[PDB]
Amino acid sequence: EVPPPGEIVRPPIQLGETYYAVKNKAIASWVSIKVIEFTESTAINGNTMKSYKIRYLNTPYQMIKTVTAKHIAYFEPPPVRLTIGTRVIAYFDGTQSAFYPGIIAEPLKQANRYRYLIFYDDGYTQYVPHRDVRLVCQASEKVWEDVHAASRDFIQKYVEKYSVDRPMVQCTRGQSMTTESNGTWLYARVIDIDCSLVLMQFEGDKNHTEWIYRGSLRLGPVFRETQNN
């Protein structure tokens, strides 16, 4: 169902328990692990810095790594609904299917059919149900500081300078807009709409379609509306 609001708790990581953690690259897939060793280091100043030795589960041979709590996520979905700015891993299926890091961009609500809007670290965006998210075991007070350097500045403006009155493009299927794709500003047509997302098809290829955030500066009209202030 829709979990109720409440306290978003981060219990301490336990020895022998199952979690998710960064497989290799931090912005890539997070997979099943067992916490096999706990490391704690304390300096003359006071800061007690925690580390965790993890064993990757379901592997061809023993694979061990040392990571921080910022690179580990709980195995079960939270018992409460999550809010904007919450650091998560969200399950991407894509019609490779796996857990990738992101930020809750929208909470669960009627207006979005009780789905979280995810802004993945790699720049991808999708609507995911509550059951497909896991809370990251630790986060910075400034959550964009935990986000891959690629989407960092976008997350910072979105979260830190958050406004419900931010420019959002109003569109209908069949309209065309100038749309940015990997450095190039191309011609794109609205194919589908899903609440805060718009499905754009770039003029070059009909198989080149992408779900874009309607408030993204990758859409020319949004960029135009933002320049005029």
Binding site: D122, A150, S151, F154, I155, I212
Partner: peptide
């Protein structure tokens, strides 16, 4: 594949 969230 993704073009990001910003230009």
């Amino acid at each position: 594949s993704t073009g990001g969230k910003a230009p």
